[PDB]
């Protein structure tokens with residue numbers, strides 16, 4: 001019993017963290033096979049971050065300006081290229097600890113674990129959602145750049161690399177091909193993350209988790225259009241039939257129809273929680289996918 | 304920027320998890336050097352009232368199947384220490400980290416690697432004042448362990464029972480009044496970890512949330528209110544442990560107690576602090592500094 005924000009076991013990713021140094025700039029890199037991946041702004045000086053011309057900046061750089069550390073052993077860089085916003089440093093040594101892995105670009109509302117890292121060494125692990133506005137709400141300090149986000153299915157699916165801490169304390173970065181999530185660019189100018197919304201299908205998954213664990217008081221019908229008319233008023237993501245189908249297997253195991261749970265949530269939005277808690281939270285939680293809930297509640301393991 | 308309930312990196316512990324079977328029962332064990340550690344109720348059948356030394360007498364070494372991955376370990380000795388079984392095996396675990404066994408104190412925090420059938424499921428981050436923990440354990444998780452890291456793993460917890468959750472240190476000594484038998488058992492009234500909530504408010508101020516800043520008070524004055532609200536009383540040791548946070552934020556500990564007293568007596572008014580609509584007590588002062596200063600391992 002119980003329900004917690006659970007992160008994936010992080011061992012397979014710990015063995016892939018390295019420390020990447022270019023000039024005086026030092027951040028984290030990801031060492032898979034004979035390639036190291038890090039944010040391309042590792043080549044930026046103090047003044048260069050304000051308006052970098054990365055192509056011109058990287059032309060001023062040869063292989064020997066890139067110093068890669070893995071624990072103690074230096075790696076020889078024998079090739080460098082830029083792919084979108086990530087630098088790729090080919091090294092002469094395949095990582096012996098390379099897990100089976102894939103590169104993945106997730107969708108708003110999906111979750112993953114971040115291994116927060118400084119100087120190439122793991123500091124901590126926690127779970128995150130890709131917000132609808134393509135930011136993430138995490139714990140990133142200067143130096144955390146290059147930490148990665150991942151899911152595990154024995155195969156590690158890397159989905160996020162950390163690139164930047166914005167004003168308002170929001171966080172942004174790229175997939176592992178270097179394509180930013182959201183409108184952001186790797187330039188130190190003020191950058192607007194637009195209006196966020198609440199991940200509706202996730203809140204519903206979490207109410208199911210609440211029922212599975214004996215937390216039932218909010219159980220109490222409505223329609224998809226009626227619910228969408230309420231949800232839009234409270235800045236909730238609209239609920240599509242696809243989302244109802246993703247909640248199917250929770251509906252089965254819990255014996256509560258998707259539409260009935262929407263009725264319960266509609267009531268919760270219009271009246272708040274009156275000081276009650278759900279799963280020990282005083283707010284409605286939207287960073288659990290339906291997959292997350294079934295995973296935790298059916299004890300899925302990895303190796 | 305930002306603040307998250309953050310677990311330790313779990314790699315060194317992952318390498319130590321094995322599956323332990325005795326009869327029909329299978330749960331998790333911890334494999335360090337040539338010794339496997341697991342809850343002694345692995346030997347219990349369908350436990351309403353077990354006599355452990357009598358039940359363990361009917362067991363020989365070959366009655367315990369220990370599997371690390373696809374590899375079967377050979378069991379060459381077995382002994383009971385308090386409520387954990389210690390299975391001696393013929394092979395030292397190659398992946399043994401530098402480690403210690405420690406008994407944490409109520410209010411201290413740690414990470415749990417939830418495990419089933421010897422394989423890692425997930426990691427999350429307090430030992431309640433009433434010696435329970437509020438976790439996520441399904442049937443089969445028993446044997447999963449709690450730990451802090453310093454390159455040294457401080458093993459502090461082993462999971463034994465879903466009542467809420469309860470278990471032992473790594474010498475098999477239960478935290479709290481519990482015993483490993485399937486009778487209904489009462490934990491004490493649970494109370495809020497006052498020094499931790501304060502640490503958390505310091506972290507709030509560090510990240511820009513200051514709306515609750517307000518007045519001052521006295522340790523006895525505050526303690527009188529903490530008592531009313533089921534808070535653990537604040538001692539000078541607590542105040543001293545919050546010292547370094549007081550320096551960074553420039554808010555005196557006793558000034559922070561006054562705001563907390565206001566929050567206790569006024570509620571939160573529908574506002575939030577670090578994204579939570581409740582007061583949060585599962586961050587130690589150590590945790591706040593580790594996260595806010597990026598300590599690594």
Ligand SMILES: *C(=O)c1ncc(Br)cc1OCc1ccc(C)c([N+](=O)[O-])c1
Pocket residue numbers: 025026027041049141142143144145146163164165185186187188189
């Ligand atoms: C990011 O965490 C980071 N780590 C280490 C270094 Br040396 C530099 C880092 O980023 C600095 C930074 C600051 C602001 C902005 C907007 C960016 N960026 O252009 O993305 C980078």
Ligand SMILES: *C(=O)c1ncc(Br)cc1OCc1ccc(C)c([N+](=O)[O-])c1
Pocket residue numbers: 328329330344350440441442443444445446463464465482483484485486
């Ligand atoms: C605990 O999680 C567990 N895992 C696997 C098995 Br085969 C058995 C397990 O514990 C069952 C159990 C149930 C209730 C009680 C009170 C105890 N206990 O005596 O501690 C154990």
